[model samples]
Target: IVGGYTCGANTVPYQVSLNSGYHFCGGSLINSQWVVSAAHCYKSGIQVRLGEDNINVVEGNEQFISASKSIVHPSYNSNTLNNDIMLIKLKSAASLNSRVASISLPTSCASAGTQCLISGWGNTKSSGTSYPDVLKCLKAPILSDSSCKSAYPGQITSNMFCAGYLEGGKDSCQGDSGGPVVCSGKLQGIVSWGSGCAQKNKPGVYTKVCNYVSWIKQTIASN
Candidate 1:
C-alpha cells in the first residue's frame, strides 16, 4: 500500500499473497480452503501463499498452494469497476496454527470514521515504482459516503466505500488490489481501486464485503 510500516509475522495471519509470476495482489483467508480477494485481480493462472511475512523468501511456516478454482462475481463490471470481489479455492485445506488463521467477515457495514487497517506488499510510494519484500501495514479511517461521493462524483457507488486521509499520504497503491480492510477485527472491505495513490481528496475505494456476504456464501456452497 501507500503509507506503511513493516509489520511482524503472524500479526495478520489471515493475510495472504496472491501471485502471478510475482506478487501481484493481497488476499484474505476466509477459511482453511477459500481465499477472498478483489475480482479485478483475476488472472489466467495465479497461486496463493499463506502464513508468510517476507514475500521474497519462503519460510517454514509458509504454505504455498495452487488454486483449484477461481471465481469472480457474476455482475463484476470492469468498465465501471463495480461488484469487485472474487474467491479462490485452494487445492488443499490449510492447516491452521499460530502463524495461519482465517479472518471473519463483517456482520454489518462499517460506519464512517471507523478505524481500519490494510496490509500488502505493494508500492512503497505513489510513483508506483518499488514494491517491498516484506508485508507492510497502515491504518486509515473510513470516509463518509457523502464526502466520498463529492470527491468521486458519479464514480462512487453503493457497492463500494472509501477509506484514507483527506490530507493525502496514506492509501493502498497499485499492485495492492484484493487486500483486506479490517475494521474492528472484521473484514469490511476489499482493495478494489482508486483514482490515484494517496492523492488529496481521493481516498482509496474498496468493495463493501457486507453487501456480498450472501453471494459469497452461495458461491462457496455451490462451487
Candidate 2:
C-alpha cells in the first residue's frame, strides 16, 4: 500500500498471499479452509501462502497450501467492478497458530468514522513497479457511501465502499487484489478497486463485506 508501514512478524495472521510463483494478490483467511479475496485476482494454479510475513524469505510459520476450488460471486460484474469478492477453498485446512489464523466476519457494517487497517504485499507507490517483500499496513477512516459516490459518481455501488485520506497518500495499490480492510478486527472490506493508488478525492475502494455475510455463509455451507 502507498504510505504504509512494514507489518510486524506474525501480525495480521489472516493475511494470505496468492502466489502464482510470485506474490500477485492478497486475501484473508476467513476459516481453516476458506480464504476471501478479489474475483479479479483469479488465475489458474493459484498457490495460497499463509503465515507469510516476507515473500523473499521463508518464515518458519509459513504454510503453502493450494486452492481446491475458487468461487466468485455469481453477480460479479467485471465491466463495472461490482461484487468483486472471491472465495478460495484450500486443499487442506490451515492449522491455526499465532501466525496463521482466520479473521472473524463483520458483525456490523463499518461506519464513516471507523478507522480501518488495510494490509497487503502490494505496491508502495502510486506509479511504480514495486512490490513489498514484507507485508505493509495503512490505517484510514471509512468514508460514507455518499462521499465514495461523489469521488466517482455512477461508479460506486452498494457492494463498494471507500476508506483513506482525502488528501491522498495512504491506500492499497496494484499487486494485491484481495487484501483485508479490518475495523475492530472484523473483516469488513476487500481491496477491490480505486481510481489510482491514493489520489486526492480518490480513496481506496473495497468490496463491502457486511453486505455479503449471508452469501458467504450459504456458499460455504452448501459447498
Candidate 3:
C-alpha cells in the first residue's frame, strides 16, 4: 500500500514504478541516500521517485533513483507472510525538503500509548476500491506489549510490533501492506497483515522496523 494522508489533498509521498506502470506505497528515507519499503513491492526494474507526489507532472519535485541493491529479510517466510520488509539503496542522496524527507528509524519504542502516522494509497473500505491515485494518511495507536502479546502471543516477538484501535473497525486495509508506520517521527512498523479492514477483535499487523535495523543499516551502508 502507498502510505497515505487521512486528511487534506494527500498525495502519494513517493513514486514507485513497475513494468506495468507506477503504483503507490509508503516509503521511509532512512538516510538522505536510501529509503525503506516492502520486499513484495520490489520489481526488478522498479524506480523510486522521491520528493514528489505524482510520478508524472513534477518538474523539480521529482528525482529518479534506481535500485542498486536490495535484501529481504532471510527469515521472511512466505506462508506466514512474516518478516516482510525490504530496503532500497538509492544511487545518491535525496535533497532534504519539507515535502520530501529522510525519516528516522527507531531503535526501540513500540509500546502502548505511542501513536504513529501511516500514509498509503490503500482503499478506505476493505472490499470497496483501491486508492491508487492519491495518498492517504491515518493515525494508529501502538498496542502495549502485554496487550499485543495477548493477541499475537509468541508470534508477536520482541522484534515485531503492533498498532491499531483495540476496539477495532479502524486500521490499514487491504493493499495497504508494505507501508510505513511512523511513531513520534520514527518508523516503527511496516504494514503487513490483518484479519480484515478494522475488524473489532483484530487489527492490522506490521513489520517492526527496529527488528531489522542492522540489516537496513548494512544494506544501505554497503551501497
What TM-score would candidate 2 get against the native?
A: 0.98
**In terms of TM-score, how similar is model 1 to the real structure?**
0.97
Model 3 misplaced regions, further than 4 Å: 1-20, 54-60, 149-155
Off by over 4 Å in 2: none
Give per-residue CA lDDT, model 1, range 48-145, as digits (tens): 99988888886678999889999999999998999999999999999988789999988889999999999888888976588888888989999999
From the highest TM-score down, the ranking of the candidates is 2, 1, 3
Give the clash count for each candidate.
0, 0, 14
**Displacement of the residue 183 alpha carbon in candidate 1, Å:** 0.6
- How well is each residue in 63-177 modelled by candidate 2, as lDDT tens digits? 9999999999999999998999889999999999888989999988989979999999888988776888888999889998888899998999988999998899888899768
Candidate 3 lDDT (Cα, 0 to 1): 0.65
CA displacement after TM-score superposition, residue 103 of candidate 3 (Å): 0.7
Q: How high is the lDDT of residue 125 in model 1?
A: 90
* Poorly placed runs, candidate 1 (over 4 Å): none
lDDT of each: 0.90, 0.91, 0.65
Candidate 2 clashing pairs, residues 3+ apart or interchain: none
C-alpha TM-scores of all predictions: 0.97, 0.98, 0.82
